[PDB]
């Protein structure tokens, strides 16, 4: 077997490790917020809100999407975690800006030989669009209550800034 | 006062943008991994696994399970932006250790007032399975390559230790 980045983040986990040391945190975040981002490379979402361990829970996934997953995740951080508050975060530059459902499911059966041509990978092109229908989204399930904060912002992979939309 | 915990949020990005600076990197992650771990708030993938600006995505739910996003955002992730390894993270105290699908759709039932008992909140008990699980859901979709490297693992919240599972 060949060694790959997996080995290099054990390696460097190492010096985290002496800098953590042990320590306890509660299960229920410190600020009662849940971010729903985009998984991009160029985002670390702690220090771009300036998070200190602890602090918010951080859902990621292509594109900042609302889905039925976050809707999962959000019922888990709210009901059984405590938090009370969201942040909806898409961002500049985004991959789901780069493509179509239609070009990339031609793409899928090409390479991979599955057709996935019903399936919805939830591109955008308008980003601001794209961050008021994730809060509608939001704001039509039954599982996420009426007395939820729902921000929307856009980060800017370029420059670091967060600005409000929503 | 500010309204909102996001408010807080803009006012610390201030200082992020001071240090950012202006400056692009690539769409493609540098060391073409995604990493796949739980929203908790008690981890920042970036210093836990030594991660630079722009050099692995990140996906997060509840329990960093795979689920139907998981794998929409993979598929996006490697076959539009190029990563070609996965990590799949979960960590101690988890809030998917906390409660069965009934204990929860019960709980629903007195939070919410509705009924989620269809709903599989993809729950776990022991980790190390619980990794493996995720990992053979990964291997048996069509949609993930069979040359995909995958890797699990664990962290455990109160030491900052990252350990592989297998
Ligand atoms: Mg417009
Ligand atoms: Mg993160
Ligand atoms: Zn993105
Ligand atoms: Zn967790």
New binding site residues.
Partial sequence: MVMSYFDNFIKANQAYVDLHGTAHLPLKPKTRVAIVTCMDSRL???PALGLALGDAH?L?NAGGRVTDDVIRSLVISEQQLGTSEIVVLHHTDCGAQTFTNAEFTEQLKRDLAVDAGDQDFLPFTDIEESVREDIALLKNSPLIPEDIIISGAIYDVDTGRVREVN
């Fill in positions: 670390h979402v702690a951080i990621r």
